[PDB]
Design a protein around this ligand. Structure first.
Ligand code: B73
Ligand code: B73
Ligand code: MG
Ligand code: MG
Ligand code: MG
Ligand code: MG
Ligand code: MG
Ligand code: MG
Lengths: 355, 362
């Protein structure tokens, strides 16, 4: 748990040491090293490390204790999920026009970096994961399975990101391969404002890589066979938790304090399909629906304030607090159907310290 | 060869079919399908397919035969390289502010798409490769090596792309002033750095951004699938020939940027204005007068018609064409000469054939 945070250097340096065997001039290696060490440090560190820790804990509680070389393998997987979260966040911040991430400037904003490097850096971070899993796990029998779990969890995440970005776009309300001139002014589409669609989005963009992936990694490494019916249970629990997690993320966007979140709220002006939007829309008068349509999704101070004051008016805080409690019970109740004391504990623990 | 282009549908749909197993609402499935089918068609089609055909041919001419299900596995690897080329290109065109690719608008320029979709679409195209390799090769014994070969060739391409993109940047000149993590405000106005204008640095760059994925990768794919063991000393010879061919390929690409005709190349030149370390730039710089050096420093790397014209009219004054022609002939011989030290008639044949049709295709 604090052992985890100590190993970071080792995994970071094992990758950087791969790059350094490349066939390059020495001065050029020096530059590569400088740049990519900062890419890792700036983007991998400063998080809560929930996903990484969940790998460690699942591994430990499925087993009956664990030598130092086994911890090396588990910690690798833990740091691989964190590297994945780093990549996802660097990409998300490009897509959502981020300002601040973990209390500092978004990577893509930096004048030495820009969008062109940040795009290139994401794919690098992504691929570094698989090189690290090779270095430390190429000889484990769970090897192929672990790498399929990263690959599939990623694919789902990309699909959710696509939905999150396009769900309101004209695409969805044929793609014009001749239009490069006429930009789509963002509007909300009333038909897509429902929980069914929301759940589709958040389960894919969040649930698989934040929950399913770390848990499965621990399980795979501890040697639970891929065919055990437990995996399907863990998948369902993961969906519940991801939905729980993302709804809380949505709530923080409006109601959180950015000095504590480390990031600036932006869902309203970015025209996002969020929980607060859906809830308000389900609750509000017909004129207030018209007001939302006219005001949502505009980078414009008075507009955002109207949507804000609607969230207060319809008591979205209170409705969240009320969602949080029902969903927590529903999750706990699914957890108790696992029939595995070790995993059930870790998931209950996770639930407590998730925020 | 035309068998290869026929198989495309099968691999595209195999992946599309996988997406369509996802737990989503039926109408959302319909939208996903329609978007991602176009993603693949728009970007995977219309190329010369050199890298893909190189896999097919290597597969064939190591072997002495091959049934329809062995070919299905090879064709898959062939299309996977073409998917990889599609992804690299969508990403390149973002990085290089492209206008035109294969005679149409770059994917990222489309108003239905934009940068935020194209970036997401690249990782998608990337991962689709590994899903395809799993569908068709999960039981082959060469499986784990194949996916390592993609992974590693990709890593080298990315590093090449970083150098291609940063080699003249303050990052690399100042080099002793660290990356300022507090500057989002003051944008680096781009200038060339004279210390980097040499072939050694060039070769570093083009070997990584071009040679590994365009030559090493497809060849090693065919070889791994046909059954040559990963320890055979021929791989290291194939590596060295790949370096030579990639160098040779990129220098030609650089030549096309300035001297090509864009209705034939399918893309608009942009190296001078994007501040790229190119072969023409280095040749000129090695030949030209001292005042002409200064003129290059002032004018190179500005999106600015008069400035471009200056550089371009320098390339014409020092006759960079001729110099290219003279490079092309010497490098070709150097490559033929290496190919003949393979001691493998099939591969040697395929590489010599590749050399003939590299710029023309088919
Ligand atoms: C979403 C971010 C993750 C994905 C990022 C992938 C990064 C790797 C991109 C490598 C592109 C290498 N490559 C080599 C050759 N060119 C052709 C062009 P030129 O080298 O730019 O001249 P051309 O435009 O002339 O055809 C491109
Ligand atoms: C190959 C390079 C191309 C990029 C390919 C990878 C793109 C996939 C992006 C996955 C990110 C999903 N993800 C889930 C959670 N959030 C957090 C933010 P939210 O935007 O509110 O969901 P927040 O900024 O509020 O914390 C992001
Ligand atoms: Mg987002
Ligand atoms: Mg965001
Ligand atoms: Mg958010
Ligand atoms: Mg480029
Ligand atoms: Mg280019
Ligand atoms: Mg070029």
């Amino acid at each position: 748990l604090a052992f985890f945070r100590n190993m970071y250097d080792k995994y970071r340096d094992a990758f950087l040491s791969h790059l350094n065997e490349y066939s390059l001039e020495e001065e050029i290696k020096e530059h590569i090293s400088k740049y990519y060490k900062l890419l890792f440090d700036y983007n991998c560190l400063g998080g809560k490390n929930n996903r990484g820790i969940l790998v460690i804990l699942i591994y430990e509680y499925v087993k009956n204790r664990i030598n130092s070389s086994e911890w090396e393998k588990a910690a690798c997987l833990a740091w691989c999920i964190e590297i994945l979260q780093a990549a996802f966040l660097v990409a998300d911040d490009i897509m959502d026009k981020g300002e601040m991430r973990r209390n500092k400037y978004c990577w893509y904003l930096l004048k030495d970096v820009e969008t062109k490097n940040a795009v290139n850096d994401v794919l690098l971070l992504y691929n570094s994961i698989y090189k690290l899993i090779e270095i430390y796990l190429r000889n484990e029998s769970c090897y192929v399975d672990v790498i399929a779990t990263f690959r599939d969890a990623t694919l789902k995440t990309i699909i959710g990101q696509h939905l999150d970005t396009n769900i309101f776009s004209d695409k969805y309300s044929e793609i014009d391969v001749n239009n490069i001139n006429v930009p789509e002014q963002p509007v909300i589409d009333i038909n897509m404002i429902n929980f069914g669609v929301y759940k589709n989005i958040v389960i894919h963009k969040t649930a698989y890589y934040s929950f399913f992936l770390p848990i499965v990694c621990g399980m795979l490494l501890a040697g639970i066979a891929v065919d055990n019916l437990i995996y399907k249970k863990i998948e369902d629990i993961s969906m519940l938790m991801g939905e729980y997690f993302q709804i809380h993320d949505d709530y923080l966007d409006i109601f959180g304090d950015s000095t504590k979140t480390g990031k600036v709220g932006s869902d309203i002006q970015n025209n996002k399909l969020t929980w607060p939007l859906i809830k308000t829309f389900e609750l509000c008068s017909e004129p207030d629906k018209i007001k939302i349509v006219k005001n949502y999704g505009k980078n414009n101070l008075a507009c955002v304030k109207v949507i804000d004051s609607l969230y207060e008016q319809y008591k979205i805080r209170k409705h969240y607090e009320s969602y949080e409690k029902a969903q927590k019970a529903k999750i706990l109740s699914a957890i108790n159907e696992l029939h595995h004391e070790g995993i059930e504990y870790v998931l209950k623990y996770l639930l407590e310290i998730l925020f």
